[PDB]
Every structure is written in structure tokens, then in C-alpha cells.
């Protein structure tokens, strides 16, 4: 059952890597096997102290177990942090590695799943809560006060794995976080509203 | 209610030194409101997390937002890449 489950990920992650060549990047052994939140600080310590991802499958480095995919996730996150720190923040091979990390992390999170407030004091008294919760990463925009116009910026394409200090082309800039809006879509109008007789 | 307002602005000072990541005109475009971040475009219309059937206080930490977004399974994608060549 786990036989084809590596073969398909192999084929997909090969064919979705043509324009950026992430898989054929150089990568030595790098035995960490650590907490994935430590995955850059551990490689920082590996830089301070002192076989690529395609060749890992050809040598059979991954078993049909939980660790046999945890190592694959670990290797992808390492190569993506390396390729983020290697390029500047505006090049196309920065954004391709960011998109490839997003796609592959989404592909590897699923299919291993197959395999204090007065308003709350009113509502938890009045209603019954069946629920659902999840995590998303937010992003940033800039902020400027001109003469009575009070502008905004676009979304910075800085990835979630950048870790750099926040540079600013102006000190009269400000920075803000954009909370994503998410809920049951508000009932859209019918097609009689969209395209009536004018 | 007007339509033809400008709603984008450009400052005269060329600060184009550390700005290759933002949205440039080809300067820097400065809008009159923020952006809107949308998690997933396609709603998953069934799924009793969302449909709420009328039969039978509980919490559930689902993995990611990707449950609510119609993702294809990988065996079809490998089948289609095999059908590619």
C-alpha cells in the first residue's frame, strides 16, 4: 500500500521541478533528524562547526514508515531554506522555491492523513459550539501617511522561511500585518444581477 | 457613487534600491486601501464541518486548510504524468 505511495511522489516531484531544478541542487548527507522548528538553527550550527534528494531514493534512503517520510519533509525544508537564503528576495528563483515549498508541503501534509469574554459568556450560555480550527501564515504590507491620503502597499513576496531582519528603504515607512478574511462565502447574487439589460 | 476615482498613487522620490519584491509600475504603486488575503479559492460545499446536518460541544483540530479546498489525490496525478509520455 505504501509501495506506490513513494513512486507517485517521486514522479510528481520530478516533473514539477523542471523550471527551477530544485531536485538537482547539491545536497550532502546532513544528519539532523531534529525538531523542524530548529531546522535552520541546526544548519546554522552546522555552518559554524564545519547524495542529493534525487539520489536518496535511488539509494533507498526512505522506508515505508513514518520516519521514511519525515526525513523527506526534512530534506525538502532544508533545500528550500538554502535556496531562499542563496538568492535575493526579488529573483524569480526565490519565488519558484517558495511556491514549490508550498505545493510540496501541502502535498505531504495530506495523504499521510489518509494513511474570558462577555460575548463568550452570553453565547456559550445561549448556544452549542461544534468547531474547527487551523493555522495560516499572515503577510505584511507597508504604510504611509501623506497629506490626507493615507496610502497602502502591495503584499511583500518575502517567504515564510526567510528569517532575515526587516530592512526598510525609508524610515518614514511603517509595516502592518494583513489578517486574512475567511468564513462561509457571503451568498453571492444570482446571474440576473450580473448582466441585466442596460 | 462614482467609479472613475484614481485609487493608486506614486511618490516622487525614487526609493528603488531595496524594492524588487513589491509591485512596481514599469516606481512603487501605493494604493488607497490594503490587500485582501484569501486562503483557498474553491469552497468545499458538502463536508459536515460546513454543511451542518440536523442529526446527532465538540472540537476538532483538522490538519491545515487543505481539507476545505478540493485537492486531487496523487495517484491520479502520477497516472496523468504517465499518460503524458
Amino acid at each position: 500500500k505504501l509501495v506506490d505511495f513513494l513512486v507517485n511522489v517521486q514522479s510528481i516531484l520530478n516533473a514539477a521541478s523542471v523550471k527551477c531544478h530544485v531536485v538537482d541542487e547539491s545536497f550532502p548527507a546532513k544528519f539532523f533528524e531534529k525538531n523542524p522548528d530548529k531546522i535552520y538553527e541546526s544548519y546554522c550550527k552546522f555552518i559554524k562547526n564545519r547524495t542529493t534528494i534525487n539520489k536518496r531514493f535511488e539509494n533507498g534512503e526512505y522506508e515505508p514508515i513514518q520516519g521514511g517520510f519525515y526525513k523527506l519533509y526534512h530534506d525538502i525544508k532544508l533545500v528550500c531554506t538554502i535556496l531562499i537564503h542563496f538568492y535575493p528576495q526579488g529573483t524569480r528563483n526565490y519565488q519558484l522555491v517558495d511556491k514549490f515549498y508550498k505545493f510540496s508541503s501541502e502535498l505531504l501534509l495530506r495523504e499521510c492523513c489518509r494513511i474570558a469574554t462577555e460575548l463568550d459568556k452570553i453565547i456559550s450560555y445561549d448556544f452549542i459550539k461544534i468547531s474547527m480550527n487551523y493555522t495560516v501564515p499572515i503577510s505584511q504590507t507597508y504604510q504611509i501617511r501623506t497629506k490626507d491620503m493615507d496610502l497602502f502597499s502591495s503584499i511583500i513576496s518575502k517567504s515564510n522561511l526567510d528569517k532575515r531582519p526587516h530592512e526598510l528603504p525609508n524610515t518614514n515607512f511603517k509595516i502592518n500585518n494583513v489578517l486574512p478574511q475567511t468564513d462561509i462565502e457571503n451568498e453571492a447574487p444570482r446571474l440576473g444581477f450580473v448582466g441585466a439589460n442596460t | 457613487i462614482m467609479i472613475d476615482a484614481a485609487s493608486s498613487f506614486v511618490l516622487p522620490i525614487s526609493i528603488t534600491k531595496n524594492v524588487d519584491v513589491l509591485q512596481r509600475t514599469d516606481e512603487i504603486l501605493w494604493f488607497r486601501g490594503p490587500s485582501v488575503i484569501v486562503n483557498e479559492r474553491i469552497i468545499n460545499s458538502g463536508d459536515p464541518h460546513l454543511s451542518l446536518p440536523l442529526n446527532r460541544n465538540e472540537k476538532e483540530s483538522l490538519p491545515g486548510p487543505f481539507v476545505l479546498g478540493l485537492r486531487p489525490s496523487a495517484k491520479f496525478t502520477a497516472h496523468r504524468l504517465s499518460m503524458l509520455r
Binding site: 501623506t146 497629506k147 | 472613475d4 484614481a6 498613487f9 506614486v10
Partner: peptide
């Protein structure tokens, strides 16, 4: 910096819709 009135970019609706991209139709010398 707070005295730096910004420049509006006007769209001019007829330019937004259908602008194409005259001697190169040889009938007019």
C-alpha cells in the same frame, strides 16, 4: 515627509478598453 502630496494615476476609461497597437497603409503620399 508628511507634506508630500502624491500623484494620482488616472485611467481614462477609453484608454483602458480597446486601444490598438498613418503611412504604413500605403495609400497616402
Amino acid at each position: 515627509f508628511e507634506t508630500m502630496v502624491a500623484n494620482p494615476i488616472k485611467v481614462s476609461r477609453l484608454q483602458s478598453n480597446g486601444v490598438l497597437t498613418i503611412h504604413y497603409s500605403l495609400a497616402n503620399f
